[PDB]
Amino acid sequence: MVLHSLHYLDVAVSEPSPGIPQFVAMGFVDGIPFTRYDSERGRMEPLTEWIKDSADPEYWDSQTQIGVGSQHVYARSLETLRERYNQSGGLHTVLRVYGCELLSDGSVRGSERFGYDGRDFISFDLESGRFMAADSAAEITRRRWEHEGIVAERQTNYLKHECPEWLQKYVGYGQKELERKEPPDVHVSGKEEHGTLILSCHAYGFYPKTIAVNWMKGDEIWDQETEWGGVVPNSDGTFHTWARIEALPEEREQYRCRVEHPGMPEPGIFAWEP
Amino acid sequence: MTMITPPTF
Amino acid sequence: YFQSMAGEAPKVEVYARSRAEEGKENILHCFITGFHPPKIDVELLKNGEPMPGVTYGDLSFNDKWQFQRLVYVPFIPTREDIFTCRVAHSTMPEPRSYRWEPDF
């Protein structure tokens, strides 16, 4: 199983706009943002008290230079793909995800993926130690990188050594925020509409993301009649979700919502109490 | 060094 | 052509941080996912007027390279008000309004 993950998402665009910097790098530990570089701010910065408190200034200074240097490589990378795919100017996007996962048996999963203009470009897998190119145009990068030996060695080293070394430290520094359990506050709303009762089970403010929200009628889960929202983020790092069913309003009292979450000592059952 | 620069295309 | 672009067209969830209590302060979120390219017009509205102090969380993306954005604003739900998120994107032929479903 995956105990912990460190991931970086890069977004690089050819022309900035309101709320879209030329370049943004975001770090996540266990799915939670903790750091950001943004080309408008020009500095790497903490998104959590725990990285602020544990990082020293060499961390922010080095990440800052790595963000700025990335800004410049993605700018050249965009010009290169622009020429290669025979495109005209305007909004173009390079994306990257990369990171490692610490597994139950003390093993390291890690990968690096690049997207261009919303499709796969090129990807690297630790196990294979080789690049998969999406098309002939990525096959040119792959051939260059493969021919020289250097890029494979540098990414492996990072994804197998430095990336999990940093992940172990971040789990050290963030233990209190990352191990914490906040139970959902659960509330069932209902409105009658065109002669149907819509019943919604809302789960507010829970952490972590892992949750069971189901509607039951009698002894059965009424899953075929249920619609679920996403598990979606609140502004404060917690999560929100819901589950909705339609009922005959004479049957309202036959419906209840079961919720299970690691922050709740017991599963709860919720009904509409008008 | 936690983040790394991407390789050039 | 617009039918043909459903795969890059934003999905919208509108939800409060907390169970609404009349005149008690809360946060309204509009979570937009599944859209490409990343330029998108999002407004949070009380009774069809732009709410002040809206924060545009940064872009992220998923396993298919589709963008997501969390947009949010302090608000004070009343039973008397309608809170919407209007979203316009290039994959949509017209702006769509998404109502916050009050849960009081």
Numbering used by the authors:
A (entry chain A): 2 to 275
B (entry chain F): 1 to 9
C (entry chain B): 1 to 104
Paper text:
MHC-I molecules are expressed on all nucleated cells and are central in adaptive immune responses towards intracellular pathogens, such as viruses and intracellular bacteria. Six distinct pockets (A-F), previously identified in human HLAs, are present in the Acar3 peptide-binding groove (PBG), which is created by the α1 and α2 subunits with their α-helices lining the sides, and the shared β-sheet that forms the bottom of the crevice.
Conversely, the Met residue at position 3 (Met3) of P3 is positioned in pocket B which causes Thr at position 2 (Thr2) of the peptide to be accommodated in pocket A instead of the N-terminus. Consequently, the Thr2-side chain mimics the usual N-terminal interactions of antigenic peptides through engaging in a tight hydrogen-bond network with Tyr9 and Tyr171. The side chain of Gln64 was found to play a prominent role in facilitating the unusual arrangement of P3 in the Acar3 PBG. While in the P2 structure Gln64 forms a hydrogen bond with the peptide-nitrogen of Met2, Gln64 creates a hydrogen bond with the carbonyl oxygen of M1 in the P3 complex. Following the conformational differences in the N-terminal segment, both peptides align starting from their residues at position 5. This convergence is facilitated through hydrogen-bonding interactions of the backbone-carbonyl oxygens of Leu4 in P2 and Ile4 in P3 with the guanidinium group of Arg97 which ascends from the bottom of the PBG. Intriguingly, in Acar3 no such C-terminal conformational changes caused by the N-terminal register shift can be observed, which emphasises the particular role of the central Arg97 acting as an unspecific anchor for the peptide backbone.
